Design an enzyme around this catalytic site. Sequence first.
Site, short mmCIF file in Angstrom:
data_model
loop_
_atom_site.label_atom_id
_atom_site.label_comp_id
_atom_site.label_asym_id
_atom_site.label_seq_id
_atom_site.Cartn_x
_atom_site.Cartn_y
_atom_site.Cartn_z
N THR D 1 0.66 -1.26 0.06
CA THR D 1 0.02 -0.06 -0.04
C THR D 1 0.72 1.16 -0.18
O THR D 1 1.82 1.38 0.97
CB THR D 1 -1.03 0.11 1.10
N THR D 2 0.71 2.30 -1.15
CA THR D 2 1.15 3.47 -1.22
C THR D 2 0.59 4.36 -1.65
O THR D 2 0.02 4.31 -2.76
CB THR D 2 2.50 3.26 -2.02
N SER D 130 2.56 1.50 3.68
CA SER D 130 3.81 0.65 4.12
C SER D 130 4.66 0.59 2.98
O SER D 130 5.91 0.08 3.43
CB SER D 130 3.04 -0.78 4.14
N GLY D 131 4.38 1.15 1.82
CA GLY D 131 5.46 1.19 0.98
C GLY D 131 6.21 2.59 0.86
O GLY D 131 7.10 2.64 -0.06
N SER D 170 3.06 -3.74 -2.14
CA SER D 170 2.56 -2.80 -3.07
C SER D 170 2.91 -3.17 -4.51
O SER D 170 3.72 -3.77 -4.70
CB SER D 170 3.14 -1.36 -2.75
#
EC number: 3.4.25.1
Lengths: 204, 240, 117, 191, 220, 232, 240
Positions: D1-2, D130-131, D170
């Site tokens: 997730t980014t 998270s990325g 991601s």
Amino acid sequence: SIMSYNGGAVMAMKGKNCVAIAADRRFGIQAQMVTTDFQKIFPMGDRLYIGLAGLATDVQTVAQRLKFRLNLYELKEGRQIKPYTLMSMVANLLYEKRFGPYYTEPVIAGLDPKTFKPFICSLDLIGCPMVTDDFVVSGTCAEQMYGMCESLWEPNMDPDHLFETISQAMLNAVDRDAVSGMGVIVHIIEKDKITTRTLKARMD
Amino acid sequence: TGYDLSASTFSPDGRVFQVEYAMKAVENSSTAIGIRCKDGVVFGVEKLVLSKLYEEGSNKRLFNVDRHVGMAVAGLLADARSLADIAREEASNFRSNFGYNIPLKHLADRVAMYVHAYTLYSAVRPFGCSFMLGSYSVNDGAQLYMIDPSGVSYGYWGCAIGKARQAAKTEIEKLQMKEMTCRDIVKEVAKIIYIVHDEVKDKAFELELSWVGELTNGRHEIVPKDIREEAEKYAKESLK
Amino acid sequence: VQVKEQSILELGSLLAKTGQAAELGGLLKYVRPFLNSISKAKAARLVRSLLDLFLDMEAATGQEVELCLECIEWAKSEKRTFLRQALEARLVSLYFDTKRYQEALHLGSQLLRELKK
Amino acid sequence: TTIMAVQFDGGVVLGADSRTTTGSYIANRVTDKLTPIHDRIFCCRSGSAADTQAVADAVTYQLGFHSIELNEPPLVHTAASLFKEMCYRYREDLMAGIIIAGWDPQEGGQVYSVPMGGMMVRQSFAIGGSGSSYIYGYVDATYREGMTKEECLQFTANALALAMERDGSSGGVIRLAAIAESGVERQVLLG
Amino acid sequence: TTIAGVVYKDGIVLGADTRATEGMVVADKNCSKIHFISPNIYCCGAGTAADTDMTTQLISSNLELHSLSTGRLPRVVTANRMLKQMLFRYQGYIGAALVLGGVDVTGPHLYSIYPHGSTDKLPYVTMGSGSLAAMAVFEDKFRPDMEEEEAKNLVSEAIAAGIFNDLGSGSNIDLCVISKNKLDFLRPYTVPNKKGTRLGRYRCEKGTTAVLTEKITPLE
Amino acid sequence: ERGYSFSLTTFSPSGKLVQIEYALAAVAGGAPSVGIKAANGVVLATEKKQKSILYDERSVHKVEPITKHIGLVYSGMGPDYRVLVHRARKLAQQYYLVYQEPIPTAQLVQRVASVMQEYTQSGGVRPFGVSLLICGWNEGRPYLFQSDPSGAYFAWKATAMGKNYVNGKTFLEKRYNEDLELEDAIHTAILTLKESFEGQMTEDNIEVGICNEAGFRRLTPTEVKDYLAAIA
Amino acid sequence: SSAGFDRHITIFSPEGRLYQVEYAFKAINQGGLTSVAVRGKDCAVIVTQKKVPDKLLDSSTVTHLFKITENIGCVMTGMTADSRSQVQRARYEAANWKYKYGYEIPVDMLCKRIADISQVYTQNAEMRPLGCCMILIGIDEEQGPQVYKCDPAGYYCGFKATAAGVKQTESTSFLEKKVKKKFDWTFEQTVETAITCLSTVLSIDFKPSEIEVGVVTVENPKFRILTEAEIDAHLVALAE
């Protein structure tokens, strides 16, 4: 376990125009029996019974709470209860105690009040209404009881051979169990009458 | 009669007398006007002194609800201080949930609902107050609002609350509104208070003026009153 | 079912417009069991309408009173209240067309012993 | 997730990946991480999935009622306040990272950041997820003040493509959205 | 437990096995995991048995209550919104992994619902224990705008992969096709596994059991 | 509120209840209605007028379904009718969530009248001004019941309510027999509603709902236009 | 006659009637205003004049044409304090339909939710029944336009063209003569009849400054309040 605190075994088997139910006769605390005449099958009218297993508190409590709702139901209406309606009534009573449940596993076996059509079902400790067409079992010694009825069941069975099948099913499964025994009672019910027999089991 | 005891009952022709009674309670109170020029709102309250009866500066009816919002209450004074607590409390929760300043269109609505809620039940009575809401903002201009005891609230350029209601707004509309600086309007307010209410019933009367607009940067405060005092000097130039 | 209904109603409207009663009265004798296919109250409007198109052809009273007694005695066997009342009301209208004297008045007295009851 | 958000002289430009994982399994290849609250205000959600969908509905409910009553298009700072009030009050029960970015008639284009604590801060560009830890160095040496719209579209496209390559959580496809005074231009890329 | 679902050019095909295990023992050779919601919306459940039962009966109650008040038709987004708002309220303590599918005025719609409240709108979903096996067949074999027989062949292929490669799925295949006008619900669709026959008479003569005490009670 | 909760219905010095008798007066001056139970189904027929040519008939409905096989009409007043419809809708759901079985028609009427009676004894409120006609074809035998603002249930073969109900009462006393069919029941229901009607009886002036053993069914205006041919 | 307290609270009369609710029907007529709703084949027009007694009063904060949702507008008659309380209820329950159900509320279902609340105020005896009317418009999918009317008794029904306010029995009598002659209704045919009915009943032949038009269209389902210029455009166009 908590289910293994007192032991128990309830089997119900569907016949041709009749249904039979059975249970054991032992009340003990984990190794030490107390009595030989503990009741686990309760009448809920005519040609419609219920068996309870698991924790002996919830055996006695749920059988009283179910009788509380049942006597109100037959007075507010004029009729007796249909076996589907009883199954939905029990599954309601278990699911209300969702987070802290009653440690029991009920088994319902009766006939039609309109015809002679047999009915069997069993529930979880939270109320999943599983119905079958051959047999249902519940109790601590569950796998031994599947060893019998998968091997000993025929579709169209007169009440004689229905009695001989469920008797040899219980006596061999229970006597392999350590915490179940001390006698077996068998109710075989049909359209005409109700027969109650007590078998000759190992008293150890 | 017979129908005019509760706020829950109607009349046989279909009105509510308890609201009708509270409206003329506000009418038997002193005069307070409010007018907006092109870059602000000016408040003016005629305030009566009987002989001495207090200090100079007790029980002012120019309340200060928000940092950019004013009041011009008239009527029963104890209930007016209740609404000032309610209107203050309403603007704070707008600041807490949101976090830009309260618009004046909401603050008219949110208060007038609480006024309207006291006109339904037999438990409570209607408020006996009426008041003006004045603001200024560089995104919205100035706005001027007006609440009655029933709860009917909407916009004005010039209004007037009290005994001199129709007699005061006769000559408010003689002026201009767009071609006026509010500093010119300040001395224009003071003559109207000086014109109306001849001292036949009440000899002594004060004149409190409050003033929010462009020059005060949106902050509401009282006029510099003892400072420069040009209102009353200009107001008493009308002896003939 | 319905395609035979509108085919015979087509032929039934054909037999009326042309002007023959043997082909038409033979059809009315034919469709007597077909009345037990539809509503007992919807059938009676149809029987009324077919009887009127039978009558409004030509003053040939050799069979008109004869078809009426067929339908009434059919209703005496079938026992519908509204059917026999619909037939009697037409029949006494037919007798007054022929200027009858007692048997019109005898019949009309017999219906009022039942209709207002 | 980014997730990604860059403002410019007109409106803003948003962007996110599409890959939803359940820990090592892809439960969804393609996901609308970004959410229309209002016609000029989006968000782009990160962290939990059940939580961020729950908050974004309630904010859309409250901002929708508030704007009809006020009878004007709302403020982007007003919508950023509403995410702050819920995420601070239930900071013990929500794992949510939200970037709010939208065009406003009063103040042009705005980008806010509401991380998992429940604070709020306006930024020129803002990343999260998270990325997002893998593109800190790239976004600091490549961002230059005064970009056009098409430069920002090229800027966020390269920024998301690097984190999708390097992070395992991601990936998927790239969703972009350019909010301006005129309209909302949404497009789906690869590369 | 293995459930799946797909959207073809007209309708929606759902599918499931019939097996409820209790621990590692097969408790039911023929369950029923495709549930009724409305005459245009069905649902499939996984995970906890009773929690999927009592949830899907509650929502089918409210939509019947809602659509009888409006008098028009239920909508799939309404069934989606009631479910995710309920399951989030209980903080995920109610295990219910659903697959929601139905055809509205707008068209076919398919939904996957996780027991914490997160939902997705997808063209094809799989849930359950043998869901990873079923997703392998969907991804290797899918094209948009299929036919009905192409889709019914596809889902039965995906469910059969869940049975033969997983210990939680072991029985008959159910299907359900919900088109814009036609509702087909096929409880025996394919029986891949039979039971071997018995080769030995085990029944003894009547009276091979010792009885202590009998009792007869006649009835009416 | 405050905590008043005082019942505004007490006994007369004669020994009768005053407000319930006045609530029955509002029911008797309402729109006429008729219901006939005829050994294979039950037919409800109300009488719907419109004061102008400006109203719409596809909007307000009198025959209202309850479960899938239980219909319900009224004869009293309008806004109070819709209250206890929505009350009875939810009241049939707690039966079906618990028992997983469609509620019997006798079981609703015990519950609806219990709502309605308990409503009159409690304080601060007036009784309803609605009488009901409930029907349904449950377990083979069809049923037809009637409630009232007092909260008392009955079991009619064929009754009528609204205006001129005693005239419709004597008419059904001669028209109804031991048994008919469903279509004959519809034909006599329009006949007794045509007693106290006005001159225009179109597909819009009446509104008819039946209960088959196949289920509840509401009649569209197309058939009611077609069935009114040679009506009564 | 009067038994008990049947003139005061909402209980029954010996004649089987009640009186408070039918007092509330002519509590509208103290407002002194008349509003007309006309539904055409692909539109729905709302027209309502306004009375501006004071020059010191805005021409913006007055008009009763409110916007419930983006596809539903309304008009209020009766008194004003009870009207805006009714509108905030309608705004509030329209949004809850979105949050609970997901799709946009129909214009028909909203009138049930309003009329249920007005029922309860009639029902419990210790509160006032809110005398003000309600007219809604809006475009339904696969149903076209709708026009409804909630009442303070608590009932509603659909309409084709129905006015409210002070003058109905002359306004509805004219609309019946307009509808039953089976003419065409397109857009400007519908707008011109909504003017000329209000023109002939009030007998004014006014200047385009008092009335407001709130039409909604199939091609543009947004609720739209017409500009004063284009209101003047329609008025001179129907003028020959």
